[PDB]
């Protein structure tokens, strides 16, 4: 069983950069190596077949190269839509086998979150649960600290974050932090605060609401 050892497993590169991804076959595979680009939650797209041939319709900034058992995919100038996980696959023998993929993030300038806070909807408290939703929008880099304060007290364990995939044009992230409380609990505190620390923010921005207003 031929193994395709792919490196790096992930990388960050600025738009316009040259990017090379390497696959090493564990035995001679001749030219029977394919390269695929997979946007998250999409079918892989074929970029290169027979180790060096541009599949029709793929932009010209993609190219593939072979040096013995070493295969290289190159992107000559990186575009933001090239954010994806790239896979090489060999089909010399059976089973055709993939490298473990390379996740390509676009490095861009610092962009501070715009942060909003949402109170639970009235239908939600009717059903007996309270979800406060804090929304950080269009920020780069991914690293961010979302903090919940209720009545000026630090929460822990009752919240959960979710980050979008990198936007294919501006390369920013978006994040939702949701506080889950029992309806009784939500009805037993007044101040609901979301305070976000991010590199693009000089001081943490806190966005609050007051229950029932």
């Amino acid at each position: 069983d031929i193994q395709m050892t792919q490196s790096p497993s992930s990388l960050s590169a600025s738009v316009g950069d040259r990017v090379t991804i390497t696959c090493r076959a564990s035995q001679d595979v001749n030219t029977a190596v394919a390269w695929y680009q997979q946007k998250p939650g999409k079918a892989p797209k074929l970029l290169i077949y027979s180790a060096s041939f541009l599949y029709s319709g793929v932009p010209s900034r993609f190219s593939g190269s072979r040096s013995g058992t070493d295969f290289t995919l190159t992107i000559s100038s990186l575009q933001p839509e090239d954010f994806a996980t790239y896979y090489c696959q060999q089909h010399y023998t059976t089973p055709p086998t993939f490298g473990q993929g390379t996740k390509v993030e676009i490095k861009r300038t610092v962009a501070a979150p715009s942060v909003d806070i949402f109170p639970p909807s009235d239908e939600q408290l009717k059903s007996g649960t309270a979800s406060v939703v804090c929304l950080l929008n269009n920020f780069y880099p991914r690293e961010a600290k979302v903090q919940w304060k209720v009545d000026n007290a630090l929460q822990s364990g009752n919240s959960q974050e979710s980050v979008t995939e990198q936007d294919s044009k501006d390369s920013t992230y978006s994040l939702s932090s949701t506080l889950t409380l029992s309806k009784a609990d939500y009805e037993k505190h007044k101040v609901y605060a979301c305070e976000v620390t991010h590199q693009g923010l000089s001081s943490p921005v806190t966005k609050s609401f007051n229950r029932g207003e």
């Binding site: 077949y49 027979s50 993939f98 949402f118 239908e123 059903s127 979800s131 929304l135 979710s162 609401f209």
Partner: protein, 215 residues
């Protein structure tokens, strides 16, 4: 146009069975090989099985050998993956693809993929709760809550609105049910004059809900 359309994914108990389909248009499956390739959550691509529909010669990755059967029917131009004895590790998006029988000896077209979830938990439809839009810019959303299994598709205004939409990846809560929020950014001058709905759809529970969002 060459197309491979899959169906048959869903929720299966450990030990259970599920039959996927991969329906082809724009060519003949008898002309090529058909593969199944799967991607477990946050993992890489894993080849699963292949078939030559003209003779039914089949090959299998060892981790599904015995448990899975690939097959095709050339009169429906469709191929099938019958899975049995599904275990939790089999949970993955299953793609089909075709081998480059014409020219390029590679996987050139693919299905959209179908999610298979091996878990003891039971189906549950979500509840859809507006995110209230509380002069610059303003944002408003729909909170889809407490469902199983994945996925839910949500569109805004029956699909008409697409810009500034941010549908977050589903997150699994301690209860064992998924929750997500889908939020849009809107011009302030449009508030009220333009009315906003989300079309939450959760096919495993026949849940189609449109919830208007207003101030």
């Amino acid at each position: 146009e060459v197309q491979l359309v899959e169906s048959g994914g869903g929720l299966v108990q450990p030990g259970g069975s599920l039959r996927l389909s991969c329906a082809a248009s724009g060519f003949n499956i008898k002309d090529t090989y058909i593969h199944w390739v799967r991607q477990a959550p946050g993992k890489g691509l894993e080849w699963v099985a292949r078939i030559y529909p003209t003779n039914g010669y089949t090959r299998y990755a060892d981790s599904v050998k015995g448990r899975f059967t690939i097959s095709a029917d050339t009169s429906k131009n469709t191929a099938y993956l019958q899975m049995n004895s599904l275990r939790a590790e089999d949970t993955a998006v299953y793609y089909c693809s075709r081998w480059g029988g014409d020219g390029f000896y590679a996987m050139d077209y693919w299905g959209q993929g179908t999610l298979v979830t091996v878990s003891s938990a039971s189906t549950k439809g979500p509840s859809v709760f507006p995110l209230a839009p509380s002069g610059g810019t303003a944002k408003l959303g729909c909170l889809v809550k407490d469902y199983f299994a994945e996925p839910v598709t949500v569109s805004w205004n029956s699909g008409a609105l697409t810009s500034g939409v941010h549908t977050f990846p589903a997150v699994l809560q301690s209860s064992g049910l998924y929750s997500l929020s889908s939020v849009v950014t809107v011009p302030s001058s449009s508030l009220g004059t333009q009315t906003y709905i989300c079309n939450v759809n959760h096919k495993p529970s026949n849940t189609k809900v449109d919830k208007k969002v207003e101030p």
